[PDB]
Design a protein around this ligand. Structure first.
Ligand SMILES: Nc1ncnc2c1ncn2[C@@H]1O[C@H](COP(=O)(O)OP(=O)(O)O)[C@@H](O)[C@H]1O
Ligand SMILES: Nc1ncnc2c1ncn2[C@@H]1O[C@H](COP(=O)(O)OP(=O)(O)O)[C@@H](O)[C@H]1O
Lengths: 146, 153, 375, 845, 375
């Protein structure tokens, strides 16, 4: 029940509206603590409209649904990469990796690869370090690194 | 005549291969494409049978999976594939001590330098994935095994 | 290997074939034209004779053998017999291979087209000559001579012709025939000798008289006087040895025989004797040319070989012909082979060579090709 | 170890015989496909191997191992033998006989230093010019006491096995030997002689032993004789500088059981015609020239002659001398030779003088200028000298020559004599004396040769020259061709018997006739009544007849009548010949100069009568043979000739006589045939002159040889044998095992092959193959062999790819995730909430 | 065992048989042709003689025997006697069992066809020869001689002929016959000697005188001169011993008896002497050939054996014949056996071998087969 009950919490903190719906002021007011601003009209509401009425957490779940669609655990991913790397923890070779995405199977574009690079995709030694990329995105990112 | 299962089984092996090439289907892999699943027929069969003029490479053409479908069966359907028992007799001619040893190099060079070759790594690798050892190697054993296909059980 | 070959000139005579290679002065091979086998044919103990060679052999062979002449009167009556003679000339005498050489054969006056045609086929089919020609015997003779104008008296074996030529042209109408020649004389002589109480019926006996005619016979300055002289004549009696061993004397007969040419009445010919026919021929030609004819007339053939022939002939001719008119009588030294030579030339005519008849022509047209629009 | 080879490859005895295992192994699988690779006719070389580009119609387009393109003819191309064949012992084995095939094999072996090949019965050995270890006594050890199959071709074999055979089989045996100079023909005779020596002692059986008197061993016994006899015989023909005039059967006989009893010599063939006459770059027997030279001069004087070969007509007919000779030295030698054989010089004086007597008879003229018809002697110089040497009365002799008187129930005077005749008696006289001398000599060797040791069964040896063809063939040639023919027919008949026996034994159906017989029509034409020979002879009778008459006779009888009888056309120039024949043999053309004239043998009775008196040797020879006696008119003979009506007998009749005798013996004993060759004009090893051998082969008849082999079903194998190799061509599931019963499976292969039955037949034991089936078979295996190779390679390829595969699939899922998740990322990073959530979480405690 | 066999050549002479094996230079067998029994036939004590063998036996037996010649004048009149003789030839003289050997018989000129046939039937049926031939005696002799050409004078026992031959051909028409020959001459010597007062009637005596004919006689250079010389003749008086022991003289007689050939009128034959018959024979031939015939005159037969015969022959012809003519008389030295030798050539003639008649031929066609198309 993890994740959603997890979500359930996130939703309620902001709530305190009545009854449990997290409606516009909640959102804005959350920001203050948050403590970053917060376009207080408009934008916030537009956020609402992807959904059809007040939410209520359940629809909060349902709205999310795209998020569920692709994404495997965490784990399993590593996982897929691991298959790539004959060597150690070392890990995946840069030049291999570009080649394996880009010309290979479902092709990354010229730009598409580039975006990833530009974000940099922490890397050093002229290579790559995956775990820190996962730390940002899938783990969600909760840092990275100062 | 094949038959859903079947051609469809051929299809998804095919699917991945397309996926590799980027994502579309060469023509060329062809022989390999449904060598993988089982018919032996060799370059000259491949080349004429449809890859391109025997398909040195790209980008002369592209198959595609469905066309490739009927190929796999007909280009199959012969039969004379080849066969462990028959091979041995071939192997034996070299063997010359009838010992069912050879003579390991002789051996690799035979199939190499003979008939069509047959690259060095490929030869070297196969024999000792096949795992029969050097003094001297049952060319009959090696053939009998390798024919049988790599797994066995 | 320049290009060009010989020509086999075969001349088919009524009594003698003459043949050789063109470009030669005279026929290398001359042999009797006959066919003959043991008339009696005894048997014996064995064999090794040839059934009808005739050829040279016969003449030595006299007494055993028989004669036939396929070409008896100049036209070849018998083909089968004919084939063999050609075989003899090629193989036996000439020792040549017919395959290799173009061959020129000659034929008689008034030879039928069919006759040429039979000849032709035999040459090609039987013999395998590459090439073949058929030549007009008198014409060859004309060729040999070399004279454009004038008039010729050809008396050989068995016919005697007077033939005016003006600019190479034998005026056909002018031309005269006498059957008489010298086969007849041979025959005549047999008769005359017999009256004395000598006999020469036979074939062997035939040859003998011929020998006597050719060695002994002569033509008189004047027939009438000659008879007159004979009585007191003492030269006339010369003697001849027979093969038998016995000896004949030939007094008057010597001149008597040839007199016949001048006087055909001897044998029983109605014919005008030679001088008259000559004259008849010229008058038959246009008046103007006659001057030339008279000046040039010209003896040919074996039967014109008698010494005394020319001198008389002018004597006779002058008598017939007009006062002022000039007369010459010409005779070639080796007249008899005049026929062969003439052929020898025209077979041997390189410039003319296109004339020769080909196997292809024979195939395409037929043998007739040689006949029609050529020789 | 494996290889078709035994004992020790390396050991030196082996190398002529063996081939080393390695050499064989390399040899057998050199490349080969029948289809292109072939032979083409080459104007110069003979044939050449080459390969085919292209075909259409009669013309074929081709490339050679001189690699130009000629377009030969369809027939004119020659299919080669399959690879399986090469390095092959017995050429007969070869599936494709063709001449360039023929060159290839023996050529290939010889360079190899392999001299010997086996052709059917025949054992051919080539001349290595170089020295070869083969001869070694170590090798001998390998041989002796072995069967011939057991080792590759060698003399010691033939000598041995025959030795055994004589004992077991208890029969005489024979070997023939051919070889021109550079055969090595002589050595083998040494080699064999010793061989006799080796076993003749050996025994296992006891034959009468004595301590012994001696006089030289056999072998030497023979050898001592040689030089002199070949001085006098021997000579230089226009062709052949030293060609023996005569034919030697040298008889070594043994006892039942293989003791050697001893030896004797018989001679046949003396063309006396040389004696008077010689043509061109040729001359008489050596001696005439020799005598005349100045080694000898005491002898010349006994002769009463001025030493100068020119001086006399009998001699003078041809040229005086030849290079490379020295008459004098040879004179010295021969006098020495005469000594060594060890007679007793009086006989020498003796033997000289009487040959000498011949010469004097050479002197005298013929005339009394034929009063009227008869010829009477002129000079009586020679007759007295003649008279003297013999010791006979010159009044008599002269008379006897002048007019011989003879006998019947009453005696008649042989009027008989003419101017033309007489001389054809002086020469005959000369020839007779010489030959009688030769013969008397021979018997003497036998007395000497007589050893101790008993004999039942002998082996050995015939020597006379091989078939010849000349620009100008003549009486000499035709006879030789005649002799060869029947011989060859003899051979054909012999094997014809055997094969059908074998066929019968196996029980495969035989339909054939004796192989010899096909020829018979030809020889008959020569031999039989109204034959060319017979016809010629009686033509001889007619006093009248001439070349032509003879000519027509043959023509009438034969010309066109037989395909055999044909004639040369005139060409330019080139040649003149009366007629040509087609012996088995190949064709031949002959011409006349001589023969009837050459023919005339007449006996002169009274001379023989006269001759009977006086000098001791003379009485003996003329009286009759050596101690022995004869018979008369009771109970003989066949129209043997005896007189021939009058004038004694001709050559042709006697020729019949001899040959019949020869045949009688030969067929008595079991033949073996050896042919020795010389490879090529310049003497080098390896080497093969294509033209020379080819000519050799037809003359050899070896090709003929091959032709008979065509006739039947050559290739034979066991079924079991057949199955083992061939099956790879047509496989089935069931294990080779001896699971597949040999009978069934081979049945299965053949029919499933769909060969027609005609080609082969079964067979309890063997399957009978025709020409060519094997050729088909071999070829197909060749093509088969390749394909599976490629197919294995196909297999190996699959191996690679299949193995790739799992790695590939494995990657696929890894990849798939990669692509989508990042893609998941591409949107997320933008979408506000996602970002916020990530920030929000760490807020949580 | 190759093949082929002998031929039994027995020449049936009017007085002598000569028989032999083919390929023999001359006959093994010659014995008389007579049949004869003891005339008186005394009886005796015992027997053991052979009645009419006549054999050789008769000759030594002279006085006792009668004689008969079945073949008296050359034609076998008496088959019964003849069978006796042939039996003798085969078994007794030759000792050869006939069935084994093909036998060639000679036969007289103008032997009747029937005569020929009767011979055949006997050989096959009586003797059982596998094969046989009949041949002609004159013909045989020509064969032995080997003269293609020339005229032959073949005087034998009792016939004499002149046969001009040209290329192996007896010319039938030329041929002259003579009754006269040895048998006649033998009588003549007999009668003449009796003239002296000697008496030689008997058979025994005839044998005797024959002996004197063959030893003593000769022919003269010139008859007339010799006779005249006879008066002074020291030489003639040669003597001859008789078996009785008495010695008789001859020598006028020596030449006179032979002179008969030249002048047959002596005995009373009108016929021309051989010299002139020769001339007549030649004249009967054609002239051309005659030259050869003069050149080659060959003598034949026993009655031409007299010495100096040729020289005389030479002179006589020279006398008759033409001035220039070349004349040569050739005589074979053992001329009498010319007939046998003769058969010997033909008999052992293996090309010709078919010519022998065979049993089947005898059966199918009959004996006449021998006659009718062959010999
Ligand atoms: N010297 C000569 N004298 C007379 N007549 C001759 C002479 N020479 C040949 N003849 C004859 O000439 C005739 C052959 O002449 P030829 O011109 O050849 O005749 P054709 O051409 O008609 O056959 C024969 O009758 C022959 O006898
Ligand atoms: N030397 C001789 N001199 C004379 N007459 C001889 C001589 N020899 C044989 N004759 C005779 O020849 C005759 C036999 O000759 P031949 O030719 O055999 O006759 P035919 O053939 O007619 O029987 C007998 O009369 C015989 O006396």
């Amino acid at each position: 029940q993890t994740q959603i009950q997890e979500f359930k919490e996130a939703f309620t903190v902001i709530d305190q509206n009545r009854d449990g719906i997290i409606d516009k002021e909640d959102l804005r007011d959350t920001f203050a603590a948050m403590g970053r601003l917060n376009v207080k009209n408009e934008e916030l509401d537009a956020m609402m409209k992807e959904a059809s009425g007040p939410i209520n957490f359940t629809v909060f779940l349902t709205m999310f649904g795209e998020k569920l669609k692709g994404a495997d655990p965490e784990d399993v991913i590593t996982g897929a990469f691991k298959v790539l790397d004959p060597e150690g923890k070392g890990t995946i070779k840069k030049q291999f990796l570009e080649e394996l995405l880009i010309t290979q199977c479902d092709r990354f574009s010229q730009e598409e690869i580039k975006n990833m690079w530009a974000a940099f995709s922490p890397d050093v030694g002229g290579n790559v370090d995956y775990k820190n990329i996962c730390y940002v995105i899938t783990h969600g990112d909760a840092k990275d690194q100062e | 005549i094949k038959i859903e299962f079947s051609k469809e089984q051929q299809d998804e092996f095919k699917e991945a291969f397309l996926l590799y090439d980027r994502t579309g289907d060469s023509k060329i892999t062809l022989s390999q494409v449904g060598d993988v699943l089982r018919a032996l027929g060799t370059n000259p069969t491949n080349a004429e049978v449809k890859k391109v003029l025997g398909n040195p490479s790209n980008e002369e053409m592209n198959a595609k999976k469905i066309e490739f479908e009927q190929f796999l069966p007909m280009l199959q359907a012969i039969s004379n594939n080849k066969d462990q028992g028959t091979y041995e007799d071939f192997v034996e001619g070299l063997r010359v001590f009838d010992k069912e040893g050879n003579g390991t190099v002789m051996g690799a060079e035979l199939r190499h330098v003979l008939a069509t070759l047959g690259e060095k790594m490929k030869e070297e690798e196969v024999e000792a994935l096949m795992a029969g050892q050097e003094d001297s190697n049952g060319c009959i054993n090696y053939e009998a095994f390798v024919k049988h296909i790599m797994s066995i059980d | 290997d320049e290009d060009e070959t010989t020509a086999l000139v075969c001349d088919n005579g009524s009594g003698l074939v003459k043949a050789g290679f063109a470009g030669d002065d005279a026929p290398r091979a001359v042999f009797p034209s006959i066919v003959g086998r043991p008339r009696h044919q005894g048997v014996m103990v064995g064999m090794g004779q040839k059934d009808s060679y005739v050829g040279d052999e016969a003449q030595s062979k006299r007494g055993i053998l028989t004669l036939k002449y396929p070409i008896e009167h100049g036209i070849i009556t018998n083909w089968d017999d004919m084939e063999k003679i050609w075989h003899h000339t090629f193989y036996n005498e000439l020792r040549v291979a017919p395959e290799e050489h173009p061959t020129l054969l000659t034929e008689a006056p008034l030879n039928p087209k069919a006759n040429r045609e039979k000849m032709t086929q035999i040459m090609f089919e039987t013999f395998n000559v590459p090439a073949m020609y058929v030549a007009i015997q008198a014409v060859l003779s004309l060729y040999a001579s070399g004279r454009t104008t004038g008039i010729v008296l050809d008396s050989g074996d068995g016919v005697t012709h007077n033939v005016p030529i003006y600019e190479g042209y034998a005026l056909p109408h002018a031309i005269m025939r006498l059957d008489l020649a010298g086969r007849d004389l041979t025959d005549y002589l047999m008769k005359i000798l017999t009256e004395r109480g000598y006999s020469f019926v036979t074939t062997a006996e035939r040859e003998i008289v011929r020998d006597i005619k050719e060695k002994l016979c002569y033509v008189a300055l004047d027939f009438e006087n000659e008879m007159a002289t004979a009585a007191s004549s003492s030269s006339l009696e010369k003697s001849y040895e027979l093969p038998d061993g016995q000896v004949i004397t030939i007094g008057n007969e010597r001149f008597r025989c040839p007199e016949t040419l001048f006087q055909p009445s001897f044998i029983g010919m109605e014919s005008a004797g030679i001088h008259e026919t000559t004259y008849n021929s010229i008058m038959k030609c246009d008046i103007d040319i006659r001057k030339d004819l008279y000046a040039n007339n010209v003896m040919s053939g074996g039967t014109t070989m008698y010494p005394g022939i020319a001198d008389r002939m002018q004597k006779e001719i002058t008598a017939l012909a007009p006062s002022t008119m000039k007369i010459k009588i010409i005779a070639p030294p080796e007249r008899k082979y005049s026929v062969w030579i003439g052929g020898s030339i025209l077979a041997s005519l390189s410039t003319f060579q296109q004339m020769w008849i080909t196997k292809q022509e024979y195939d395409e047209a037929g043998p007739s090709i040689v006949h029609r629009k050529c020789f | 170890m494996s290889s078709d080879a035994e004992m020790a490859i390396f050991g030196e005895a082996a190398p002529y015989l063996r081939k080393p295992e390695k050499e064989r192994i390399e040899a057998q699988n050199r490349p080969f496909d029948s289809k292109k690779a072939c032979f083409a006719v080459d104007d110069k070389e003979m044939y050449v191997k080459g390969m085919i580009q292209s075909r259409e119609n009669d013309k074929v387009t081709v490339k050679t191992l001189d690699d130009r393109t000629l377009t030969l003819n369809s027939d004119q191309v020659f299919p080669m033998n399959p690879p399986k064949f090469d390095k092959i012992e017995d050429m007969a084995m070869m599936t494709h006989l063709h001449e360039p095939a023929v060159l290839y094999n023996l050529k290939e072996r010889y360079a190899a230093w392999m001299i010997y090949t086996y052709s059917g019965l025949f054992c051919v050995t080539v001349n290595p010019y170089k020295w070869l270890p083969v001869y070694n006594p170590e090798v001998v050890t390998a041989y002796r006491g072995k069967k011939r199959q057991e080792a590759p071709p060698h003399i010691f074999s033939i000598s041995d096995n025959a030795y055994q055979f004589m004992l077991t089989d208890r029969d005489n045996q024979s070997i023939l030997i051919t070889g021109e100079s550079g055969a090595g023909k002589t050595v083998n005779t040494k080699r064999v002689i010793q061989y006799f020596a080796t076993i003749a002692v050996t025994g296992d059986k006891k034959k009468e032993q004595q301590p012994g008197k001696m006089q030289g061993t056999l072998e030497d016994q023979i050898i001592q004789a040689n030089p002199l006899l070949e001085a006098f015989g021997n000579a230089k023909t226009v062709r052949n500088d030293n060609s023996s005039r005569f034919g030697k059967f040298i008889r070594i006989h043994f006892g039942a059981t293989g003791k050697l009893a001893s030896a004797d010599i018989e001679t046949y063939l003396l063309e006396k015609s040389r004696v008077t006459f010689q043509l061109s770059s040729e001359r008489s027997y050596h001696i005439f020239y020799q005598i005349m030279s100045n080694k000898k001069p005491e002898l010349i004087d006994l002769l009463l002659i001025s030493t100068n070969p020119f001086d006399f007509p009998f001699v003078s007919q041809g040229e005086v001398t030849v290079a490379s000779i020295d008459d004098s030295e040879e004179l010295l030698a021969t006098d020495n030779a005469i000594d060594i054989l060890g007679f007793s010089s009086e006989e020498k004086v003796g033997i000289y003088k009487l040959t000498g007597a011949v010469m004097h008879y050479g002197n005298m003229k013929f005339k009394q200028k034929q009063r009227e018809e008869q010829a009477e002697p002129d000079g009586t110089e020679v007759a007295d000298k003649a008279g003297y040497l013999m010791g006979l009365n010159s009044a008599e002799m002269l008379k006897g020559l002048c007019c011989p008187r003879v006998k019947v129930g009453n005696e008649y005077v042989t009027k008989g004599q003419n101017v033309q005749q007489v001389t054809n008696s002086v020469g005959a006289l000369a020839k007779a004396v010489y030959e009688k001398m030769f013969l008397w000599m021979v018997t003497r060797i036998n007395q000497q040769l007589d050893t101790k040791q008993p004999r039942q069964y002998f082996i050995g040896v015939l020597d006379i020259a091989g078939f010849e063809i000349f620009d100008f063939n003549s009486l000499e040639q035709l006879c030789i061709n005649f002799t060869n023919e029947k011989l060859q027919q003899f051979f054909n008949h012999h094997m014809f018997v055997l094969e059908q026996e074998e066929y019968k034994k196996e029980g495969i159906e035989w339909e054939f006739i004796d192989f010899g017989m096909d020829l018979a029509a030809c020889i008959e034409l020569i031999e039989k009544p109204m034959g060319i020979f017979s016809i010629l002879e009686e033509e001889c009778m007619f006093p009248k007849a001439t070349d032509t008459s003879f000519k027509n006779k043959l023509y009438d009888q034969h010309l066109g009548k037989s395909n055999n009888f044909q004639k040369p056309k005139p060409a330019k120039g080139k040649a003149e010949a009366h007629f040509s024949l087609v012996h088995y043999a190949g064709t031949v053309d002959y011409n006349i100069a001589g023969w009837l004239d050459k023919n005339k043998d007449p006996l002169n009775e009274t001379v023989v009568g006269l001759y009977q008196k006086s000098a001791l040797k003379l009485l003996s020879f003329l009286f009759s043979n050596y101690a022995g006696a004869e018979a008369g008119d009771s109970g003989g003979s066949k129209k043997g000739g005896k007189k021939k009506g009058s004038s004694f007998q001709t050559v042709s009749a006697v020729f019949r006589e001899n040959l019949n005798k020869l045949m009688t013996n030969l067929r008595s004993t079991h033949p073996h045939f050896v042919r020795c060759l010389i490879p090529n004009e310049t003497k080098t090893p390896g080497v093969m002159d294509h033209y020379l051998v080819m000519h050799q082969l037809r003359c050899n008849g070896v090709l003929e040889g091959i032709r008979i082999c065509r006739k039947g079903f050559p290739s034979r194998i066991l079924y079991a044998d057949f199955k083992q190799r061939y099956r790879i061509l047509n496989a089935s599931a069931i294990p080779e095992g001896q699971f597949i019963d040999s009978k069934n499976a081979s049945e299965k292969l053949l029919n499933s092959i769909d060969v027609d039955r005609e080609q082969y037949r079964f067979g309890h034991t063997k399957v009978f193959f025709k020409a060519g089936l094997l050729g088909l078979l071999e070829e197909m295996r060749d093509e088969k062999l390749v394909t599976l190779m490629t197919r294995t390679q196909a297999l190996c390829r699959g191996y690679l790819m299949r193995v790739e595969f799992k790695k590939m699939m494995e990657r696929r899922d890894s990849i798939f995730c990669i692509q989508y998740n990042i893609r998941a990322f591409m949107n997320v990073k933008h979408w506000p909430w996602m970002n916020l959530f990530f920030k929000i979480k760490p807020l949580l405690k």
